[PDB]
Amino acid sequence: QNFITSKHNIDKIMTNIRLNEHDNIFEIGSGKGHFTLELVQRCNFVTAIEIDHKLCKTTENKLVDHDNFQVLNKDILQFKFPKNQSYKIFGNIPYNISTDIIRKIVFDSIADEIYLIVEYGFAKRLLNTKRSLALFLMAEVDISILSMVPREYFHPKPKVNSSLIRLNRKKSRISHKDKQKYNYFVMKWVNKEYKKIFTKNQFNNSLKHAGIDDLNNISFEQFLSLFNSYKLFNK
């Protein structure tokens, strides 16, 4: 399924993407040379990553008269992203893409932007409140559907589709300062344990101030309001 190769699609989806030849990026998955090639000439440098040795050789060649190399073959989860130079990230790892890779990628790198095709269903998984994962990512990165990946641009596996997503950061809050506090909150909130967050004197105006009715459908923004109220309550 490690497909999706065919320069015409790999040009049509790169279409809406904002990489250029000033960007150094990380190829989270390798695939089968397909993408690590379209980018090597599109961005400055590239550093792919896929563990099994075979694949790297595959890539290794599909990239000649092209020296923007680096096709390391280690466990991404274990990978140490740079914490100095600025860069982006791309990964055609739908099917193989977990949440642990999405975390490495988002909370453990200073990657400015993260583009990645993911099963469309995995998108909401990241796009819905009352789902910590989302409430956590949304505090720094901005998740958005950029494109879709209809037909079998890959091979089979439908039941569903893939879809291109962009994760772009903002300096934004949720100050490391109060970040253990934001996690509790996120934790307790999604766990419906509002009894640990604020008191009922609070669970109310808080909701009323965030202008929250469908409490079962928050808007992060509202969750934001909440955390803030919470943050400034003391009983």
Swiss-Prot record:
Changing residue 95 to A: Loss of activity. It catalyses: adenosine(2085) in 23S rRNA + 2 S-adenosyl-L-methionine = N(6)-dimethyladenosine(2085) in 23S rRNA + 2 S-adenosyl-L-homocysteine + 2 H(+). Its EC number is 2.1.1.184. This is rRNA adenine N-6-methyltransferase. This protein produces a dimethylation of the adenine residue at position 2085 in 23S rRNA, resulting in reduced affinity between ribosomes and macrolide-lincosamide-streptogramin B antibiotics. S-adenosyl-L-methionine binds at residues 2, 4, 29, 50, 75, 92. Keywords: Antibiotic resistance, Methyltransferase, Plasmid, RNA-binding, S-adenosyl-L-methionine, Transferase. Changing residue 124 to A: Reduces activity by about 80%. Pfam families: RrnaAD (PF00398). InterPro entries: KsgA/Erm (IPR001737), rRNA_Ade_diMease-like_C (IPR023165), rRNA_Ade_Mease_Trfase_CS (IPR020596), rRNA_Ade_methylase_Trfase_N (IPR020598), SAM-dependent_MTases_sf (IPR029063). Changing residue 99 to A: Decreases affinity for S-adenosyl-L-methionine 8-fold. Reduces activity by 99%. PANTHER family: DIMETHYLADENOSINE TRANSFERASE, DIMETHYLADENOSINE TRANSFERASE-RELATED. SUPFAM superfamilies: S-adenosyl-L-methionine-dependent methyltransferases (SSF53335). The gene is ermC'. GO terms for cellular component: cytosol. Belongs to the class I-like SAM-binding methyltransferase superfamily. rRNA adenine N(6)-methyltransferase family. GO terms for molecular function: 23S rRNA (adenine(2085)-N(6))-dimethyltransferase activity; RNA binding; rRNA (adenine-N6,N6-)-dimethyltransferase activity. One of its GO terms (biological process) is response to antibiotic.
